[PDB]
C-alpha cells in the first residue's frame, strides 16, 4: 500500500478494483469478449461434424505435416481446425461424422509446432480414438 | 447351547405388555429362528408363546451375538388391540387383502369420473 491512513478503505478498494483490470487473467475471465471469441463458449468438450481433412505445414525448425480436421460445431456452428493426436488416426476419421473436440491444455492457445490450432479430437462417432489406436474397439460399419 | 438374556426391561401398563431387548448367544450355529425365540421366552417367563412377539434381529460381526426387540402381551385380545397388522400377518392370525395399490388408485380415479350410484358399478 501507499496511502496508509486509518480511513482509506474506499481509496484502497477503488484503486485495487481499478488495477485488477490490467491483469491478463482477470480481464480475460471477467469480460465477455474472450467468452464470445471462445468457440466452446465456456465448455470443456464439444461435438461437431467433419467436413474436410487438412494437412497443416509446420513452423520453424521442426518441419512436418500435421493432420487436422475442419470441424463445424453443433452448439454454435463455428469452424475449428481440430487436431488429430495419435499416429495413423486420420484414416479412422471419415467425412460427415460427429467427433468430440476438446482443448490441448494451454487454455485456448496455439501449442508448439502447429500454427493456429487450439483444439484436438477425443472421440470419433461415439468410439474413442484412444481405443481405435490401441485396437480395442472397431469402427461401427 | 443357545442362551437368551434380557436387557432394558420395562412394563407398559398403558400398552398392557412387557418389553425388553433380547440378547441371543449361539456359538456353533446360525441365527436361531423367531419360533425358537418365542418358545425359549415362553419357557423362561412361564407364559404361553402366543402373546410373545419378537422382531428386529441384528447379528454382530464374528458370529456369536445378536440384538433383537420383543414384547410380551397379557392376552391375544390385547395383542390384537395394540399390535401392528403386518407383524400379526408375520405369524398368520391376520391376513391382509391382495388389492394392489396402483389398481386401487386406478379404481379410485375411475370412480371419481362417474357421478352417482354407479360408482359401485364402475368397479367390476
Amino acid at each position: 500500500g501507499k496511502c496508509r491512513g486509518l480511513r482509506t478503505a474506499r481509496k484502497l478498494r477503488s484503486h485495487r478494483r481499478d488495477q485488477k483490470w490490467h491483469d491478463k487473467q482477470y480481464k480475460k475471465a471477467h469480460l465477455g469478449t474472450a467468452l464470445k471469441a471462445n468457440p466452446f463458449g465456456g465448455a470443456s468438450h464439444a461435438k461437431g461434424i467433419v467436413l474436410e481433412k487438412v494437412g497443416v505445414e509446420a513452423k520453424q525448425p521442426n518441419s512436418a505435416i500435421r493432420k487436422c480436421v475442419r470441424v463445424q460445431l453443433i452448439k454454435n456452428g463455428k469452424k475449428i481446425t481440430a487436431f488429430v493426436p495419435n499416429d495413423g488416426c486420420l484414416n479412422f476419421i471419415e467425412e460427415n461424422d460427429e467427433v468430440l473436440v476438446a482443448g490441448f491444455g494451454r487454455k485456448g492457445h496455439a501449442v508448439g509446432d502447429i500454427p493456429g490450432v487450439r483444439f484436438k479430437v477425443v472421440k470419433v462417432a461415439n468410439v474413442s480414438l484412444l481405443a481405435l489406436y490401441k485396437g480395442k474397439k472397431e469402427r461401427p460399419r | 447351547t443357545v442362551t437368551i438374556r434380557t436387557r432394558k426391561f420395562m412394563t407398559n401398563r398403558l400398552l398392557q405388555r412387557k418389553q425388553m431387548v433380547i440378547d441371543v448367544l449361539h456359538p456353533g450355529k446360525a441365527t436361531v429362528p423367531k419360533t425358537e425365540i418365542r418358545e425359549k421366552l415362553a419357557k423362561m417367563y412361564k407364559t404361553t408363546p402366543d402373546v410373545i412377539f419378537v422382531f428386529g434381529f441384528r447379528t454382530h460381526f464374528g458370529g456369536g451375538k445378536t440384538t433383537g426387540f420383543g414384547m410380551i402381551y397379557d392376552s391375544l385380545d390385547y395383542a390384537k388391540k395394540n399390535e401392528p397388522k403386518h407383524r400379526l400377518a408375520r405369524h398368520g392370525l391376520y391376513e391382509k387383502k391382495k388389492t394392489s395399490r396402483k389398481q386401487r388408485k386406478e379404481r379410485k380415479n375411475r370412480m371419481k369420473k362417474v357421478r352417482g350410484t354407479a360408482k359401485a358399478n364402475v368397479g367390476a
Binding site: - | 456359538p27 454382530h60 460381526f61 464374528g62 458370529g63 456369536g64
Partner: protein, 185 residues
C-alpha cells in the same frame, strides 16, 4: 429433502511434490518396516498426525490457565494415553509436537500381533487378520487398521472359529482327509 447424513471427510492428503526421492525413501522404509498396503496408508496416518499437531499448536497458542485450553489438553492427553502412543508419565501438551509416524504405526494391530509373536511375519499377520483367525475381547477383527488400546492390548488371541485355535479344521485339511479316506476305502 431426504433423511441422510451427507457428512464425509478425506482421511488422507497427498503431498505437494509427487517425486521427492527422500520422501519416497522414507515412505518405502515405513511400508517395508511395518507391513503396509500402499502409500495412502502412510498418508492417512500422516494426516491424522497433522490433525493432532494442529490441535496441539492451537492449544500452545492459547494462554496458560485457560479453561478451554486445559480441558482440550487433558482430553487430548487422555486420547494419546488410551491409544498408547504417549506414555502415562510423559503426558503434557508440549510433548505432543515431539511425536512420530513410527510411534503411530507401532500401535497397528498387525504390528501388535507381530510383536506378541503369534504370527510368523508382518504380512503373515495381515493374512491372519484377513482370514479371521484372531479376535479381540470375544470380537473377530477382520481389518488390520484396528487401533489397539492399551487397555485392550492384552486381550489379543486367536478367535474361537479358527482352525489355528480351538475349532474345526479348514477346507484344505478336510479335503485332504476326505481324499485319504477315499483312497483307503
Amino acid at each position: 429433502p431426504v433423511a441422510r447424513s451427507w457428512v464425509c471427510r478425506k482421511t488422507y492428503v497427498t503431498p505437494r511434490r509427487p517425486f521427492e526421492k527422500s520422501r519416497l525413501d522414507q515412505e518405502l522404509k515405513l511400508i517395508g518396516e511395518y507391513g503396509l498396503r500402499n502409500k495412502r496408508e502412510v498418508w492417512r496416518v500422516k494426516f491424522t498426525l497433522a490433525k493432532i499437531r494442529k490441535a496441539a499448536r492451537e492449544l500452545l497458542t492459547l494462554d496458560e490457565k485457560d479453561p478451554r485450553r486445559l480441558f482440550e489438553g487433558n482430553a487430548l492427553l487422555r486420547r494419546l494415553v488410551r491409544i498408547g502412543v504417549l506414555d502415562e508419565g510423559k503426558m503434557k501438551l508440549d510433548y505432543i509436537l515431539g511425536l512420530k509416524i513410527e510411534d503411530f504405526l507401532e500401535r497397528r494391530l498387525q504390528t501388535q500381533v507381530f510383536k506378541l509373536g503369534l504370527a510368523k511375519s508382518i504380512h503373515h499377520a495381515r493374512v491372519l487378520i484377513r482370514q479371521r483367525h484372531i479376535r479381540v475381547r470375544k470380537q473377530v477383527v477382520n481389518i488390520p487398521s484396528f487401533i489397539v488400546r492399551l487397555d485392550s492390548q492384552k486381550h489379543i488371541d486367536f478367535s474361537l472359529r479358527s482352525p489355528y485355535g480351538g475349532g474345526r479344521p479348514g477346507r484344505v485339511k478336510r479335503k485332504n482327509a476326505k481324499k485319504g479316506q477315499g483312497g483307503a476305502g
